[PDB]
Structure 1
């Protein structure tokens, strides 16, 4: 038999070491590469939207620099007169755009806050923004839930949908937690 590191014994010794290993890389077992935020099932190339080796999401259109026709470079001439960004002024379509586009930015959260303010709630399981439909008060508001007519935002068809459902405050999210520390690089904590 093989007492050594190059035998079968040597193999389960490495596997059972991953139990006690707090490190994110176990060169013996590997890792689920589907969970690295790349669409390995994509029928389209990944490289055109390849963010960086540390990013868990592809390039958004706001990330891609584009040589826009000269005329569109407004900011240099209108900087002073141009209004400042105040999410309270903007409509719900804008807040929903800002929300659905800034996955992992203070902007998703700042938008989620302005949405939360306007009474919209986030279903943690159904993964949708819900709010009270005009004039329809829930049938039985109780200790753990409420049931009635609700307006919810459909991000695939980009519209508010009246869908009648039962919602448990447990499955509903509280006031968005705004990260206080400004010096955060998600590239540093990437596994």
Structure 2
């Protein structure tokens, strides 16, 4: 009767963090379940999803003579890229490295007075409400800027000491 019992010595684990680790309102977590372990759940995984046939083989997107559309021409694809909003150009620039479309979005953003920061790998542009003041050595300017954050999909204003060797 010692064993059956009232003499326990001292399972147990705070499941809060583990539940936040999964997708927990009512929400299915299993259809996007990466792995049974956290340490090995290192990326999101593509769920099942439905694509109607009308979603595919869509002709003449932006007057394209080919299907699907492509962006293979530095000289001739500027007219299409110009039609896109800043955010769309950011999306392309961050999604297709080492391609024609990355170069075209760079040039177009450049034209809209965005400048690309080399070491932050982030685009910024002048905040119109204030004038920069260039540093005495001329290697930098201090001013107000709007940075684009591709992870939050937000423009973010910042007072910043900006070095000219760092932007292109």
Question: Same fold judged by TM-score > 0.5?
Answer: yes
Asked if 1:83 is matched to 2:66, the reply is no
The RMSD of aligned alpha carbons is: 2.7
Out of 121, 132, 135, the position equivalent to 2:126 is 132
Instruction: Give me the whole-angstrom Cα distance separating, in 2, the residues matched to 1:43 and 1:163.
Output: 37
Q: What is residue 161 of structure 2 aligned with on the other side?
A: 166
**Secondary structure of the residue that 2:87 maps to in structure 1?**
helix
Distance 1:135 1:87 in 2: 28
1:43 aligns with 2:44: no
Task: Kindly state the Cα deviation for residue 117 of structure 1 after the two structures are TM-superposed.
Answer: 1.0
> After TM superposition, what 4+ stretches of structure 1 lie above 4 angstroms from structure 2?
none
SS at match of 1:75: coil
Q: Give the Cα–Cα distance (whole angstroms) in 1 for the partners of residues 82 and 132 of structure 2.
A: 27
CA distance in 1, matches of 2:58, 2:120: 40
SS state of the match for residue 133, structure 2? coil
For residues 42-191 of structure 1, the aligned pairs below 5 Å read 43-44=40-41, 68-73=51-56, 75-76=58-59, 79=60, 82-84=61-63, 86-140=80-134, 143-173=138-168
Question: Which stretches in structure 2 are left out of the alignment for 5+ residues?
Answer: 1-38, 64-76
SS in 1 for 2:90: helix
After TM superposition, the score normalised by the length of structure 1 is: 0.51
Per the alignment, do residues 91 and 141 of structure 1 end up closer, same or farther by CA in structure 2, a change over 3 Å counting? farther
Structure with the bigger RCO (C-alpha within 8 Å, sep 6+) is: 1
Mark the runs of 5 or more structure 1 residues left unpaired by the alignment: 1-41, 50-60, 174-191
Q: Aligned ranges for residues 2-17 of structure 1 at < 5 Å?
A: none
Once the two structures are TM-superposed, the CA of residue 122 in structure 1 deviates from its matched residue by: 1.2
Question: Please, what TM-score do these two structures have when normalized by structure 2?
Answer: 0.57
Determine the structure 1 residue equivalent to 2:30: none
